[PDB]
């Protein structure tokens, strides 16, 4: 269009070739991945359940892009963004199922299971506190399968040594504690001093619909207002948007199968 001021959008989620200060991102260098892309932890730990139809809930997101940006800045954007959306879905699902965070739609979660059974250990990381944490599971005939931890506490785990065998209980190379694998959560909600464990075979999940992507050049984005408050029309404003959706289902077969260690 002939507008020489860039379009202000509310919310400002539209990708643009030109910044608010007038900078065209011409000649633009290809972005590169400063971090490893994160993979779903409950999809790693939990037990898959073949499921037909939906309890399930629907995850989804829409990424609008100005066609000037899709032309003159980063042409490949929508191919390079699909994994980043898959990351975002993994993180949303993990945070809902594990921590009961992010307005999880299910009435089920590990945090709620632990908060219901009160299976929590107050204390700092010590060999005796790790053993007590595991014994809270083995009390009810269930054996720990893995650990969930904030990666920032490996500094605490390296300081623990078995005083009989006189060796590190934590293998920093294997990233396994007491012979059990430790998975790391990048989310900000699990605090430094918090550690979770359980028999994750008691946690069941299903995926009725894999991540489906649809690119559209014509729809109306009711949720994104132009500066004047009119809804964004993709075709008429010369805009493109990518829709991604997935269906996920979560089940906890035995809510006593999970225990948590927390700072005193």
């Amino acid at each position: 269009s002939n507008n020489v001021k860039p379009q202000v959008f509310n919310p400002d989620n539209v990708m643009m070739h030109e910044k608010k200060d007038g900078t065209l991102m011409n000649e633009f260098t290809t972005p590169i991945l400063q971090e490893v892309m994160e993979n779903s932890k409950i999809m790693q730990l939990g037990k898959y359940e073949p499921m037909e139809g939906t309890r399930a809930f629907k995850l989804g997101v829409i990424l609008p892009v100005t066609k000037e940006f899709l032309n003159y800045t980063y042409s490949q954007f929508f191919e390079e963004m699909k994994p980043m959306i898959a990351e975002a879905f993994y993180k949303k699902f993990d945070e809902a199922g594990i921590l009961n965070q992010g307005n999880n739609p299910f009435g089920k979660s590990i945090a709620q299971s632990i908060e219901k059974t009160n299976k929590v250990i107050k204390g700092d990381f010590t060999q005796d506190n790790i053993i007590d944490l595991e014994a809270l599971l083995e009390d009810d005939e269930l054996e720990a399968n893995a650990f969930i931890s904030k990666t920032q506490n490996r500094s605490l785990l390296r300081k623990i040594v078995d005083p009989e065998t006189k060796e590190r209980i934590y293998d920093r190379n294997s990233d396994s504690l007491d012979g059990l694998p430790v998975v790391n959560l990048k989310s900000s909600n699990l605090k430094r001093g918090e550690l979770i464990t359980g028999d994750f075979d008691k946690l069941i999940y299903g995926i009725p619909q894999l991540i489906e992507y649809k690119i559209d050049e014509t729809a109306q984005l009711s949720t994104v207002k132009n500066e004047d408050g009119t809804p964004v029309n993709l075709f008429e404003q010369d805009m493109v948007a990518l829709r991604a959706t997935m269906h996920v289902a979560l089940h906890i077969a035995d809510d006593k199968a999970f225990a948590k260690l927390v700072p005193a």
């Binding site: 994994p83 898959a86 990351e87 993994y90 894999l210």
Partner: peptide
Amino acid sequence: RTKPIDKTDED
């Protein structure tokens, strides 16, 4: 590169 047919791998 190991891949499924549709679900582009994040690694």
